[PDB]
PDB file of C-alpha atoms in Angstrom:
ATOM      1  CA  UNK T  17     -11.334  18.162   7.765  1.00  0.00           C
ATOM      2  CA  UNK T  18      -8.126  17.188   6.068  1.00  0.00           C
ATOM      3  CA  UNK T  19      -5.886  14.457   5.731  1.00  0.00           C
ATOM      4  CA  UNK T  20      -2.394  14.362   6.617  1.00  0.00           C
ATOM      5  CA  UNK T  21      -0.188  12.584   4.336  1.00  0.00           C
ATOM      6  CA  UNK T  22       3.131  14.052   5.395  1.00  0.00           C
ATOM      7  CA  UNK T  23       2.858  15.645   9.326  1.00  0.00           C
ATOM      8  CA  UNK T  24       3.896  19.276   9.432  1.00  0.00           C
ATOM      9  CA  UNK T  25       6.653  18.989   6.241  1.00  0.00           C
ATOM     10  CA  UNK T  26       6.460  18.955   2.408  1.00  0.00           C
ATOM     11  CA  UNK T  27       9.682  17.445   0.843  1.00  0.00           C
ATOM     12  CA  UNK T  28      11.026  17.616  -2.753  1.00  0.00           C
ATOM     13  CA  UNK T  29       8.180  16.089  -4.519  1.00  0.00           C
ATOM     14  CA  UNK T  30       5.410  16.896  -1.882  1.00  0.00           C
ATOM     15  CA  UNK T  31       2.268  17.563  -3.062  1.00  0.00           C
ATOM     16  CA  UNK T  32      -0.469  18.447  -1.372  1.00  0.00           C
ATOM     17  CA  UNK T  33      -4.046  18.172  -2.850  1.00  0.00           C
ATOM     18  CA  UNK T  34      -7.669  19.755  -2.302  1.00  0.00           C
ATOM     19  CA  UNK T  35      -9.054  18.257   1.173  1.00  0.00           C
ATOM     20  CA  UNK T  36      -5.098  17.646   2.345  1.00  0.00           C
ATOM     21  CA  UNK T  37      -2.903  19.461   4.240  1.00  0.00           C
ATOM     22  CA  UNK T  38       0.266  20.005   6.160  1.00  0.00           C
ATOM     23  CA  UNK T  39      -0.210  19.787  10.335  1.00  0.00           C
ATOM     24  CA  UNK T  40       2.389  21.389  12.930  1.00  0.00           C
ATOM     25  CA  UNK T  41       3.073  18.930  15.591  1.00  0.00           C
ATOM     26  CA  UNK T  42       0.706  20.957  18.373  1.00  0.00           C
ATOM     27  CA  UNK T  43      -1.767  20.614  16.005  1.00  0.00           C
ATOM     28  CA  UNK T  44      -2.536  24.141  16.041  1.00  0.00           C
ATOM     29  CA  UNK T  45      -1.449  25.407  12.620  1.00  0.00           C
ATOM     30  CA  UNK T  46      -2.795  24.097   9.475  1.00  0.00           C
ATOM     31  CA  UNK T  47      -1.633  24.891   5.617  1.00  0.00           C
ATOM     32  CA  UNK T  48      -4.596  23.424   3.669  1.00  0.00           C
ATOM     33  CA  UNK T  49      -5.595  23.303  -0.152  1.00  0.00           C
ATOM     34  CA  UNK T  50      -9.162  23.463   0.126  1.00  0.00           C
ATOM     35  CA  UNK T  51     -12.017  22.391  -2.349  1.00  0.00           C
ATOM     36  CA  UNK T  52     -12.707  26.051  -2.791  1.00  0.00           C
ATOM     37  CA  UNK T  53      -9.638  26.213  -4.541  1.00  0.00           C
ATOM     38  CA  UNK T  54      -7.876  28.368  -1.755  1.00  0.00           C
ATOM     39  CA  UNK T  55      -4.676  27.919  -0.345  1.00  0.00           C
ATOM     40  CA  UNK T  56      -4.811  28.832   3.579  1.00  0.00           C
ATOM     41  CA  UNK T  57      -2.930  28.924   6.830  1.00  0.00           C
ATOM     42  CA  UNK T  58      -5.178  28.598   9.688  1.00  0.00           C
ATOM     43  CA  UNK T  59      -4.573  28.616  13.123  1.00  0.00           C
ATOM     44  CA  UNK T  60      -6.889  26.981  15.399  1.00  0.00           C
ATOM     45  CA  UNK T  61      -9.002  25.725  13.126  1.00  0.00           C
ATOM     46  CA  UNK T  62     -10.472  29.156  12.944  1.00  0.00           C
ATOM     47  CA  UNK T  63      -7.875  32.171  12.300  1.00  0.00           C
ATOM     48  CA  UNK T  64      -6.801  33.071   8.805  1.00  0.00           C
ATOM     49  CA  UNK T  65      -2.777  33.790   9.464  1.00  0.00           C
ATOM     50  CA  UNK T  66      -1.856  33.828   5.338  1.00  0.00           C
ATOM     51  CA  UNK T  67      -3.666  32.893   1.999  1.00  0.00           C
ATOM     52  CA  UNK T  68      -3.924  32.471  -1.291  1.00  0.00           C
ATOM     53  CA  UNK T  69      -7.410  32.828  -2.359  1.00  0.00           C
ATOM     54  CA  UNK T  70      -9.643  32.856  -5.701  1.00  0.00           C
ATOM     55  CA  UNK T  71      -7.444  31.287  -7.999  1.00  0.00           C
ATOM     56  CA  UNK T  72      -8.928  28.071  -8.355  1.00  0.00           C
ATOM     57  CA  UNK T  73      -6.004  26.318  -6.721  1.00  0.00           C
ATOM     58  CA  UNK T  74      -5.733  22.641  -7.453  1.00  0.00           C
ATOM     59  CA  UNK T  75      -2.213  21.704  -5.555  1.00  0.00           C
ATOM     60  CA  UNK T  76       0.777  22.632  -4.037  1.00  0.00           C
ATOM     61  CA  UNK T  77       3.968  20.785  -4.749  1.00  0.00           C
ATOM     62  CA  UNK T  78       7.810  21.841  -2.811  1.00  0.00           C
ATOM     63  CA  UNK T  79       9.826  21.210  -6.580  1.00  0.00           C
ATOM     64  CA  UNK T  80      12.885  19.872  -7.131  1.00  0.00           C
ATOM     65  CA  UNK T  81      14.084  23.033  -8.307  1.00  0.00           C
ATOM     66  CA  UNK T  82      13.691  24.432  -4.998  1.00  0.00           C
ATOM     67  CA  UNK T  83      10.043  25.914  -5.650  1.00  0.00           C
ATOM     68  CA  UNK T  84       7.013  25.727  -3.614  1.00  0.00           C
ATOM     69  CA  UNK T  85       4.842  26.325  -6.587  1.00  0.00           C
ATOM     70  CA  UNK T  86       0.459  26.124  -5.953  1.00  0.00           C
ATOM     71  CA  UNK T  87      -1.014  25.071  -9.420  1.00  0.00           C
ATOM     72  CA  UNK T  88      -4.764  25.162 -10.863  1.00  0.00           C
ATOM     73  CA  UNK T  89      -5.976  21.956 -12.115  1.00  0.00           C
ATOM     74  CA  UNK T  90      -4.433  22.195 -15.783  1.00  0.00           C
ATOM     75  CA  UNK T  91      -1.240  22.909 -14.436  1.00  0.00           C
ATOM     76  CA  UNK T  92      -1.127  26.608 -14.781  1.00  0.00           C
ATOM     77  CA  UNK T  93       1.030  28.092 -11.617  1.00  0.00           C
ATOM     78  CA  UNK T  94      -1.340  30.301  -9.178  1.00  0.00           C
ATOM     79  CA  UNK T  95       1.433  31.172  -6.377  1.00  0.00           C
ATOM     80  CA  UNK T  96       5.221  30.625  -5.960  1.00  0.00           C
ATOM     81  CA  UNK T  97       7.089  30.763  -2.942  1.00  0.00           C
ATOM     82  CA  UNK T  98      10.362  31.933  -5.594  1.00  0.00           C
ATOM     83  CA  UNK T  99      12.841  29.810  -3.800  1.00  0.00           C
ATOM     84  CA  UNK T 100      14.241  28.231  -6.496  1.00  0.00           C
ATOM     85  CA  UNK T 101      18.333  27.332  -6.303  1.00  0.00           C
ATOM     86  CA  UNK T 102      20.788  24.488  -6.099  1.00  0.00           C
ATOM     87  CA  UNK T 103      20.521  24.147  -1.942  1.00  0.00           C
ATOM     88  CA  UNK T 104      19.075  20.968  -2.303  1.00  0.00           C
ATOM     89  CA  UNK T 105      16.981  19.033  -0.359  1.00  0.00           C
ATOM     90  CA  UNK T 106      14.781  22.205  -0.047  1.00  0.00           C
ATOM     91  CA  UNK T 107      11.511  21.723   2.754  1.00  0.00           C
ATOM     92  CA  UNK T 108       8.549  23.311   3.588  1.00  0.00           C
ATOM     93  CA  UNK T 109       7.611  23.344   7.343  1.00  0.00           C
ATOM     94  CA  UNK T 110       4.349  24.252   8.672  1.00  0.00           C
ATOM     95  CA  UNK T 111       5.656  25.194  12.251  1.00  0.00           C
ATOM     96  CA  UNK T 112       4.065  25.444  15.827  1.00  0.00           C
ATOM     97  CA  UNK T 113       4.685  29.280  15.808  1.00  0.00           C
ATOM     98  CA  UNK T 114       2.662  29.939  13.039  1.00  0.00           C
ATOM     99  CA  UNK T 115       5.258  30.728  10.264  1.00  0.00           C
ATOM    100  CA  UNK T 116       5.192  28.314   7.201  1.00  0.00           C
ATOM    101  CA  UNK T 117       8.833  28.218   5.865  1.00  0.00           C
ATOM    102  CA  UNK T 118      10.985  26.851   3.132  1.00  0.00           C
ATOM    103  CA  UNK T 119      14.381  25.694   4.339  1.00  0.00           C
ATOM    104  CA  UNK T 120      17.317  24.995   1.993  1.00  0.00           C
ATOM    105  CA  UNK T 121      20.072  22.578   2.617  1.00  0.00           C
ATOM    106  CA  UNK T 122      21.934  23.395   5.757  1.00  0.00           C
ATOM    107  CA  UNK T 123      18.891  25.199   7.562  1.00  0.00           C
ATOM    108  CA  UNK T 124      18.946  28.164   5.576  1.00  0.00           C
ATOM    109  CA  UNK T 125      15.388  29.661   6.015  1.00  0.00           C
ATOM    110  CA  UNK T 126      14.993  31.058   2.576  1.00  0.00           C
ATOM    111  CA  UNK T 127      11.411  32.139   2.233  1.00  0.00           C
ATOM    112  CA  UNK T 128       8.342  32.987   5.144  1.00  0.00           C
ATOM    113  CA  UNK T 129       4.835  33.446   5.760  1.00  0.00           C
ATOM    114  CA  UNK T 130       5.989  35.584   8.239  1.00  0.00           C
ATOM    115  CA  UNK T 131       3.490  34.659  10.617  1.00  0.00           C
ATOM    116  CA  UNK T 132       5.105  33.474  13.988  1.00  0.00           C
ATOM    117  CA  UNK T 133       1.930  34.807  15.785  1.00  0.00           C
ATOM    118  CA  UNK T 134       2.988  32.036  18.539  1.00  0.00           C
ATOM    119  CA  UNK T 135       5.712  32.733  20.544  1.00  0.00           C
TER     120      UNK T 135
ATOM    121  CA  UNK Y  10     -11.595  13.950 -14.465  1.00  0.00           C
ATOM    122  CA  UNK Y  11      -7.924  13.508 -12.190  1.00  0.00           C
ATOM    123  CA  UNK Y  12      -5.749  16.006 -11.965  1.00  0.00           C
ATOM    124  CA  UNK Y  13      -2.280  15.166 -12.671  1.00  0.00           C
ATOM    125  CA  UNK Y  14       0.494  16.785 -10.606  1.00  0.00           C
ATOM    126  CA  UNK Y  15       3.027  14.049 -11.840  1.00  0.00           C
ATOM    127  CA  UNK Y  16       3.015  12.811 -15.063  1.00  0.00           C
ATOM    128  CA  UNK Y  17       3.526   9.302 -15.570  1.00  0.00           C
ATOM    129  CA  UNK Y  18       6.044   8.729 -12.669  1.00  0.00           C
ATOM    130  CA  UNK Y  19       5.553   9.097  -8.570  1.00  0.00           C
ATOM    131  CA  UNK Y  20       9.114  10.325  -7.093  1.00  0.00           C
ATOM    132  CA  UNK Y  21      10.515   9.464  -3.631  1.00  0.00           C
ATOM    133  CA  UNK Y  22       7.965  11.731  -1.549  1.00  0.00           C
ATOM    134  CA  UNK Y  23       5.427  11.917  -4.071  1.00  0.00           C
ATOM    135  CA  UNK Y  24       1.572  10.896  -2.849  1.00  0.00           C
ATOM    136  CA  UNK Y  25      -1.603  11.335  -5.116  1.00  0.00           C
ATOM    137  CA  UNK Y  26      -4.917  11.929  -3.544  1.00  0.00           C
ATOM    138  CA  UNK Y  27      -8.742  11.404  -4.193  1.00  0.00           C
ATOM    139  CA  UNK Y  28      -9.413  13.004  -7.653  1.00  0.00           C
ATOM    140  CA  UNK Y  29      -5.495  12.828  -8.689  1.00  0.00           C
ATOM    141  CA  UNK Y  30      -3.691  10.370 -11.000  1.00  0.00           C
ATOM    142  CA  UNK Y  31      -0.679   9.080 -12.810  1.00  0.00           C
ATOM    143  CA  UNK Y  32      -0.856   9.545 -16.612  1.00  0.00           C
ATOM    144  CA  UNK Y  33       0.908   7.530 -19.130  1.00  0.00           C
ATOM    145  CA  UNK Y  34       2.599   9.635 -21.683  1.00  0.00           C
ATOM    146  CA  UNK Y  35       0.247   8.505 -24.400  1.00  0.00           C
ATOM    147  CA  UNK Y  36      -3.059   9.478 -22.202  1.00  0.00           C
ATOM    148  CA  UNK Y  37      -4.462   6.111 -21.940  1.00  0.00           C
ATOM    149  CA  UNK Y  38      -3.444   4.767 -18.596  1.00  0.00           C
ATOM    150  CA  UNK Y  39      -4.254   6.115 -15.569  1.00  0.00           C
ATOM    151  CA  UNK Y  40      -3.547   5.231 -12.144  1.00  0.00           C
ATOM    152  CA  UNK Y  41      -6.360   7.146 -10.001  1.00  0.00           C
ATOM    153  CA  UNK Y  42      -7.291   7.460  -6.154  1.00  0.00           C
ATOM    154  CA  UNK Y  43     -10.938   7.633  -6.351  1.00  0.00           C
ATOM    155  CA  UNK Y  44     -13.304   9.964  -4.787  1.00  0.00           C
ATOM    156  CA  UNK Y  45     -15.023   6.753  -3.931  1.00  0.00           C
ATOM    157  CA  UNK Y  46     -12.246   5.721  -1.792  1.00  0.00           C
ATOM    158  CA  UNK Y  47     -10.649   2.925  -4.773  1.00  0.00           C
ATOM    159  CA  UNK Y  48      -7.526   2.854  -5.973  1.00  0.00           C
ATOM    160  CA  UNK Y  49      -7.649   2.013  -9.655  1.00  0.00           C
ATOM    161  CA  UNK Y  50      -5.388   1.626 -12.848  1.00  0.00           C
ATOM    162  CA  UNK Y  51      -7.206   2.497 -16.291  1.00  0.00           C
ATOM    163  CA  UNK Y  52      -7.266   2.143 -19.819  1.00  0.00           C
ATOM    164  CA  UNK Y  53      -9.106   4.242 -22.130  1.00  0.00           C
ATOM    165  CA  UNK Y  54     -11.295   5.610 -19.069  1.00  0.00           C
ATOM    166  CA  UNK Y  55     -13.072   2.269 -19.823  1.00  0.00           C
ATOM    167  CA  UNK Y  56     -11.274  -1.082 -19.032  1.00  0.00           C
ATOM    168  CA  UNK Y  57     -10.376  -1.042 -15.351  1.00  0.00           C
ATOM    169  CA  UNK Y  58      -6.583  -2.925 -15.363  1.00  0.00           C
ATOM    170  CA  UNK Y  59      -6.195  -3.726 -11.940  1.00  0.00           C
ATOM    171  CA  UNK Y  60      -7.350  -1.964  -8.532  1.00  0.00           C
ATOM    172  CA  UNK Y  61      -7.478  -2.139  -4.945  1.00  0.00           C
ATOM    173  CA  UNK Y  62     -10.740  -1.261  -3.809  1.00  0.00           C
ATOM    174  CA  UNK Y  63     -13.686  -1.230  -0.867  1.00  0.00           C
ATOM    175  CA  UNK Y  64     -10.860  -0.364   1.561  1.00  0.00           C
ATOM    176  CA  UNK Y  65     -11.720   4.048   2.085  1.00  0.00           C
ATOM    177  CA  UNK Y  66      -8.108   4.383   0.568  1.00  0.00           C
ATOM    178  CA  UNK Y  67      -7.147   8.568   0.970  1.00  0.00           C
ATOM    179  CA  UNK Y  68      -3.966   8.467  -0.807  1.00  0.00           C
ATOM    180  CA  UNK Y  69      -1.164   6.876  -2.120  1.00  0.00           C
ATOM    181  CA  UNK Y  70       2.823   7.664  -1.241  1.00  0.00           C
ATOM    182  CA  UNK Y  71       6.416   5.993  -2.886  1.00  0.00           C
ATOM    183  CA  UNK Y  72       7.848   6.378   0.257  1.00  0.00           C
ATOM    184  CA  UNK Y  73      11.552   6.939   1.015  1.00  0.00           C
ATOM    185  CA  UNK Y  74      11.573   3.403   2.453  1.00  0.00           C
ATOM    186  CA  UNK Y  75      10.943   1.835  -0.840  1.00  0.00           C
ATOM    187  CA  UNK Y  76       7.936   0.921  -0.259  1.00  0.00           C
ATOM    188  CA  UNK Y  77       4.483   2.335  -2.305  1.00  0.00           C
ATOM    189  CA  UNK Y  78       1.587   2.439   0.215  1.00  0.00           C
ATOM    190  CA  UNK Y  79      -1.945   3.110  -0.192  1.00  0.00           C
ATOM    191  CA  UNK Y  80      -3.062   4.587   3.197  1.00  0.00           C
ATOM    192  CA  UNK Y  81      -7.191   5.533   4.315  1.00  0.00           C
ATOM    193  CA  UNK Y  82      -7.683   8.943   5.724  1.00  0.00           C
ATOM    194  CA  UNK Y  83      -6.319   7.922   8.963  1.00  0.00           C
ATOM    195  CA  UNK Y  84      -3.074   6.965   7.915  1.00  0.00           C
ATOM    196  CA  UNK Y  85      -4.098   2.818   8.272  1.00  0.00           C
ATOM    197  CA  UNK Y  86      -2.499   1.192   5.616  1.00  0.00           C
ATOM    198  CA  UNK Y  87      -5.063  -0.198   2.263  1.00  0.00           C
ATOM    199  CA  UNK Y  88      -2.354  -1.337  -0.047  1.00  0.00           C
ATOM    200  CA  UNK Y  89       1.556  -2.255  -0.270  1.00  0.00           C
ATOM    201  CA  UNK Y  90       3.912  -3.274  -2.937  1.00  0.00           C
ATOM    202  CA  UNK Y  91       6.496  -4.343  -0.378  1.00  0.00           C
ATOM    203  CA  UNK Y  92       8.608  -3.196  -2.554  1.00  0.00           C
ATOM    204  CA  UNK Y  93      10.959  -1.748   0.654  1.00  0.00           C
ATOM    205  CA  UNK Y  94      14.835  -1.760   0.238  1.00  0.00           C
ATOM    206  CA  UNK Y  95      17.774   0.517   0.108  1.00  0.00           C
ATOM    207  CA  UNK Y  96      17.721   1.202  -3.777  1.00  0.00           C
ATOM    208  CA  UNK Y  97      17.003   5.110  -3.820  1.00  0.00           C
ATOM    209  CA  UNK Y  98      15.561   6.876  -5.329  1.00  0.00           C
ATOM    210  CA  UNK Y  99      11.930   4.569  -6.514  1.00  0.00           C
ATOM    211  CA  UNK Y 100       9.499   5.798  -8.796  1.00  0.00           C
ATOM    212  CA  UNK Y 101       5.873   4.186  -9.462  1.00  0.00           C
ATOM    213  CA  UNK Y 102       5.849   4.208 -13.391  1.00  0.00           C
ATOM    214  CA  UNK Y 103       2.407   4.692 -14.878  1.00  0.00           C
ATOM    215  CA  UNK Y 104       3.529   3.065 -18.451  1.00  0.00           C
ATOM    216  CA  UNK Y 105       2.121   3.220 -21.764  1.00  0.00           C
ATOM    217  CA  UNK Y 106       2.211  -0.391 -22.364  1.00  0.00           C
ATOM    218  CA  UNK Y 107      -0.385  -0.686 -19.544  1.00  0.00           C
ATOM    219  CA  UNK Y 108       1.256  -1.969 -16.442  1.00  0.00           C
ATOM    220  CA  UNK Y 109       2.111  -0.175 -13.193  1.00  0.00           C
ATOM    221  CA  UNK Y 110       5.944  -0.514 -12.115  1.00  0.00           C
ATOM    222  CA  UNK Y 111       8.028   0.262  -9.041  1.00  0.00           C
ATOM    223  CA  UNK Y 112      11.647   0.768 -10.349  1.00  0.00           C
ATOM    224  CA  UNK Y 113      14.622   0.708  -8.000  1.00  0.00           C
ATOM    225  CA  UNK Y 114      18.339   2.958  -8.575  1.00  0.00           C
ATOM    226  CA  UNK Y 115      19.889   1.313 -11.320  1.00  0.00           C
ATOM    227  CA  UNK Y 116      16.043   0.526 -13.190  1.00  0.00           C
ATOM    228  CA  UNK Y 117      15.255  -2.631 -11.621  1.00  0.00           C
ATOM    229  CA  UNK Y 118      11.462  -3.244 -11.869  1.00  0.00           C
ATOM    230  CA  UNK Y 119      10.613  -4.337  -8.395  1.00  0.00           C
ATOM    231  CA  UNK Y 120       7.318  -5.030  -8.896  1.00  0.00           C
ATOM    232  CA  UNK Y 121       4.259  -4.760 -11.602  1.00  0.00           C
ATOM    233  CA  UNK Y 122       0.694  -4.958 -11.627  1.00  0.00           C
ATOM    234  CA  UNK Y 123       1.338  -7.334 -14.462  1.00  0.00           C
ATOM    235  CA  UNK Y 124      -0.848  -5.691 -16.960  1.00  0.00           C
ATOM    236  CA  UNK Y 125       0.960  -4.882 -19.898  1.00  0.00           C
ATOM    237  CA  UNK Y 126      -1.719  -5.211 -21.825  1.00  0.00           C
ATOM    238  CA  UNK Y 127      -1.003  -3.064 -24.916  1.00  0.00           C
ATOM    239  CA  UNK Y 128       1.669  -4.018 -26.937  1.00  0.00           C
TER     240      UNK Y 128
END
């Protein structure tokens, strides 16, 4: 399973590590960094909604620059969610619908998963 | 080996877990959450400095509180510096000289491991 160390959100600064994850508040939706190396949106504990797999994935961390950025273990970026601007505090929410979204300052949704499979 | 997704310095927000570390800028002093469930503050990968440990600590977060807590998978509490107050932003320095600081707005140090050990 994975640990929780910041419920369904990952602030400027967050980082999420292998065996940790963001949770939605139903519990049903799950953005995990897995010891594989894998970076995956599950639903149910059992369907795949969105990943990033085979790139040896270390972390993911929601940058003060406004980039949710997944690194391998030396640091080298595997997968950016290219949000970067000045709209700070920037979040990303792993929501009961299914979508995992970056929000800028002032609830601008600036970059989905695009995978509300829960209406 | 950690993995360091920080540097020397954990932000406001900013939580390492098992297998990650703080790194001095000179590469001798680590602060580590251990596979093995310890929390533990290095030099030279030899001479352990300080360290919380036998308590199944998961992670540790400089929380927007103030406060730098060590929590177990569950989210039960291991480890505090009670460092809590309304100085923003904190940051948990990993230093070169060997200790472990909290510094408050305005670079109070809040608390130390007093362990300064290199001169």
């Amino acid at each position: 399973s994975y640990v929780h160390p910041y419920g369904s959100t990952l602030p400027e600064n967050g980082v999420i590590g292998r065996g940790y994850a963001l949770i939605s508040d139903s519990g049903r939706v799950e953005f995990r960094v897995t010891d594989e190396g894998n970076i995956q949106l599950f639903l149910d504990d059992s369907r795949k909604l969105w990943s990033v797999d085979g790139k040896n994935a270390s972390f993911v961390k929601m940058q003060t620059d406004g980039n949710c950025v997944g690194y391998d273990p030396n640091g080298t970026a595997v997968w950016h969610t290219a949000t970067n601007g000045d709209d700070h505090p920037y979040n990303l929410v792993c929501q009961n619908d299914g979508n995992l979204v970056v929000y800028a300052k002032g609830g601008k949704a600036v970059w989905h998963t695009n995978t509300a499979v829960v209406h």
